[PDB]
Amino acid sequence: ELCNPQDKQALLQIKKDLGNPTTLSSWLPTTDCCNRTWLGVLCDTDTQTYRVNNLDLSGLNLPKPYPIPSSLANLPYLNFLYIGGINNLVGPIPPAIAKLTQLHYLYITHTNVSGAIPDFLSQIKTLVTLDFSYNALSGTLPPSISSLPNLVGITFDGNRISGAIPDSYGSFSKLFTSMTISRNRLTGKIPPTFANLNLAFVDLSRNMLEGDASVLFGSDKNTQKIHLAKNSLAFDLGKVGLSKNLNGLDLRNNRIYGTLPQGLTQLKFLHSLNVSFNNLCGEIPQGGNLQRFDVSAYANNKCLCGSPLPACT
Incomplete structure (x- = not known):
């Protein structure tokens, strides 16, 4: 045998x-x-x-x-x-x-x-x-x-x-490309050492995270999905760079402010977007796939305007 x-x-x-x-x-x-x-x-x-x-x-x-x-x-x-x-x-x-x-x-x-x-x-x-x-x-x-x-x-x-989230989780090697820890009870901030990662996928949704998540963004990154819904994040979204590979961006239910970044109109593969239930303001960038998303993807913000929402004054 x-x-x-x-x-x-x-x-x-x-x-x-x-x-x-x-x-x-x-x-x-x-x-x-x-x-x-x-x-x-x-x-x-x-x-x-x-x-x-x-x-x-x-x-x-x-x-x-x-x-x-x-x-x-x-x-x-x-x-x-x-x-x-x-x-x-x-x-x-x-x-x-x-x-x-x-x-x-x-x-x-x-x-x-x-x-x-x-x-x-x-x-x-x-x-x-x-x-x-x-x-x-x-x-x-x-x-x-x-x-x-x-x-x-x-x-x-x-x-x-x-x-x-331990600061050492920004120290994984260059082969590390996917981190999902959604639906837990994490608290605190995303460590600044995460600027060292190049994640294809990051899902930290449904936790109690606070503060700035800008470190997970960048036009030099190769990222397909960023999922951070249902936390208590707050940062100026208009200042972030965006990966050309992004196909999904879910930031709903946080306290994020500023405008939506104009760079979103250049994303050729963006197929899912949700920024509802935040404090965003200003015109929604007109172009790319942005006007293909339902109104419900942008609603319940502070003062967003522009298509698909009513016109800006």
Whole structure:
């Protein structure tokens, strides 16, 4: 049998540790774990270790709450680990995951996992993406993950994370291009060190952030989406530079002031725009895609005017 004996026992232990759910009844001692019949399990054919390097646990419908099994640490060749959509998965992200030294892609999402996002993840130098969204995570954001050299993005949306965004999150490498931490409880300001990032995507919507978000803008940046809705931000929007790549700009429900920047008429790919429920004033820039957006995208500001709104005096 091709299945490695130690991977085999860890997988059967994981199964037992989750109450031997019927959703894992394909994990049979009588069949080879490497031959694609064990649901969600694959072995590394590419590097020819033939060790289990890809595990997907999804929608298992556990019969009662169980934590993330510490037997996951006994699959040391994991590169890809997805754990998601499991209502009855509870407890913290165990330091047992630190044993997965070759992880590239890690998702623990749409579960009831709780506690803080662990600071130990910074030691897993192969990490390319982290997704811990839609769980019950609390605590503050772990500052040390900014040292990860291959990390391209973090997806931490929809938890209960509190505290300020660490200044060290402006220190990610040039490969880091996507940061979403929406629907949490962050407070404070966006760190000035974020001028060092070049984000394709940034979503910090539905938090309690305050102050200036100008650092996330710039005509030298390569940014496709900027989503900052539902915070308490306040800065002069008319002063910001805009990435030519911008396709989505959502700043609704903040305390942003000044005029809309004339540079918006030059964005060829702007397809979604919402600046409602702010303190903006002045003529809406006429040109580009600006007059294609409904009135509701600009309404409820202080004194905006010009098409699609009534004429300026």
